[PDB]
């Protein structure tokens, strides 16, 4: 009669009395959408793998995709040559429609998974290396992966990427930032910044009209997430 303080998700009210609320006579169950699928939570929804990139290699090669790793890097013009650059988590959040499903939240504590499905013919050899380097375009110039030697590139954490032995890799890129719980509104996140390096050049028969392809693909999804503070904004 005096105490009407009820609680919604994140919302509380303050009335004089309980305002004479009427409702359903009996809450009988109806159409069977509950019996067709269980409800997917928002921590369950940010664990779906997405098709991000589709990298094709031909050897070849006129392009930069088969320049091998330099044994020495003597100057910043002749930096280390790579394939692609994924600037996590700003790539994994925008793709797959995730950012239009974690809107109206503020802080995030994620761990990015990376999987490489690989599919090449038996008549082609080679080897790559999938290194990640946190703050790789924030730290001073000499400390980045793109300026060190071949022994220094491979010494970074990662996994071997041989063709005939590995058709799938599982790498767990950790929560690797100094700030507690990544900001989203006015976001400049870009903490861990991934790379893909070829160690040996891709090898095939030197006669052409043969089409020695590689066709890498990249899957990423989050893990061990905690999504906490509600807001009204978001970056587009």
């Amino acid at each position: 009669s005096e105490n009407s303080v009820e609680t919604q998700e994140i919302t509380t009210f303050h009335d004089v009395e309980t305002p004479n609320r009427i409702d359903t006579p009996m809450a009988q169950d109806t159409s069977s959408a509950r019996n067709m699928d269980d409800t997917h939570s928002i921590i369950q929804f940010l664990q779906r793998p997405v098709l991000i990139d589709n990298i094709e290699i031909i050897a070849g090669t006129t392009a930069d995709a088969n320049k091998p790793l330099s044994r020495y890097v003597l100057d910043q013009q002749n930096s280390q040559k790579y394939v692609r650059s994924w600037t996590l988590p700003s790539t994994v959040l925008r793709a797959g429609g995730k950012a239009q499903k974690l809107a109206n939240f503020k802080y995030l504590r994620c761990d990015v998974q990376v999987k490489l499905v690989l599919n090449a013919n038996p008549f082609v050899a080679g080897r790559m290396y999938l290194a990640y380097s946190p703050y790789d375009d924030k730290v001073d110039t000499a400390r980045s992966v793109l300026q060190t030697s071949r022994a220094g590139v491979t010494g970074y954490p990662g996994v071997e990427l041989d063709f005939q032995l590995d058709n799938s890799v599982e790498m767990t890129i950790p929560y690797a930032s100094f700030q507690e719980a990544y900001d989203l509104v006015t976001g400049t996140e870009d903490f861990v910044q991934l790379y893909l390096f070829p160690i040996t050049p891709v090898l095939g028969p030197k006669s052409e009209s043969e089409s020695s392809k590689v066709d890498i693909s990249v899957y990423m999804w989050l893990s061990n997430i905690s999504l906490v503070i509600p807001t009204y904004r978001i970056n587009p």
Partner: protein
């Protein structure tokens, strides 16, 4: 009976007053007294309280009025009270200061001195000493109404960057961005008070913003030039904007008052030095407006 010396050579460093800026450790200050065991009594029968009157749990647990609002029938709904306060409807959650008044005197025919004068809540006044803070804030919003004023009033949190207006000498909030229908209040933590018979509410806001400690700069040197420290000091703002307009008959007055109290519980601080670009100068009110205040400088 007079043997030779058996002790080793004691090494040595000549440091008079080694580590004087620490509250623990035996200090070499000579007492100018009769007894070396000079012991004052305990705190019995001296101060007429029994509460330990210096713990930060009690000093910062002292309520102070910050804002006095005037909520009118002229003012619209779903829009905070913009009154020339200038903060008023947008109270920044956080322990250090956020407001300032500027005193403009004259020196020559074309030169003036603009001295920033700040108000000081006791939660604010302790935080000026220390550099980095972390505290669970509190606010007790009270409506000063008659028996006949009714309505519904909303207070909602928002974490992060506060909307501002940088000026030549001060920072004002920006009520162009908090109106509408351009900034909804449907996903924030909120409380919808009722002016029918309920009057007061205390809204405890714990500390959550992506860092272990914020800064205690606040509004010192906050202007168009230097306003990084103002953003990294609060974890957002409360916002008092009305859901439903004030319903008042012609007998009672159309103006009600909203008094915003402030304190801070569970306070912890980091360094015993001021983070500001100036010493802790306490403002002494001059007798006549033509007189100026002595300024502490930074040479040694």
């Amino acid at each position: 009976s007079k043997p030779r010396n058996q002790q080793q050579v004691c090494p040595l460093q000549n440091v008079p007053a080694w580590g004087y800026s620490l509250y623990k450790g035996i200090d070499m200050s000579v007492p100018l007294a009769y007894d070396p065991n000079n012991e004052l009594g305990d705190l019995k029968d001296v101060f007429p309280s029994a509460v330990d009157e210096m713990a930060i749990g009690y000093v910062c647990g002292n309520p102070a009025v910050k804002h006095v609002l005037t909520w009118k029938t002229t003012d619209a709904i779903q829009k905070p009270i913009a009154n020339g306060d200038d903060w008023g409807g947008v109270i920044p959650v956080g322990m250090p200061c956020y407001s300032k008044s500027i005193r403009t005197t004259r020196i020559s025919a074309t030169e003036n001195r603009e001295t920033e004068v700040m108000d000081a809540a006791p939660c604010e006044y302790v935080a000026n000493m220390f550099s980095y803070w972390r505290a669970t804030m509190c606010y007790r919003i009270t409506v000063v109404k008659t028996a006949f004023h009714t309505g519904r009033l909303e207070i909602f949190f928002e974490p992060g960057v506060i909307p501002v207006k940088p000026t030549v000498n001060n920072i004002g909030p920006d009520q162009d961005r908090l109106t509408g229908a351009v900034a909804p209040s449907d996903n924030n933590y909120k409380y919808i008070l009722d002016l029918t018979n309920d009057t007061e509410v205390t809204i405890r806001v714990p500390f959550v913003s992506n860092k272990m400690f914020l800064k205690t700069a606040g509004i010192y040197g906050a202007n168009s030039e230097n306003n990084w420290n103002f953003h990294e000091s609060f974890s957002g703002f409360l916002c008092i904007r009305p859901v439903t307009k004030l319903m008042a008959p012609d007998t009672v007055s159309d103006n009600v008052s909203i008094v915003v109290w402030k304190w801070a519980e569970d306070v912890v601080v980091v360094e015993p030095k001021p983070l500001t670009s100036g010493p802790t100068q306490v403002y002494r009110p001059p007798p006549t407006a033509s007189t100026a205040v002595e300024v502490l400088n930074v040479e040694l």
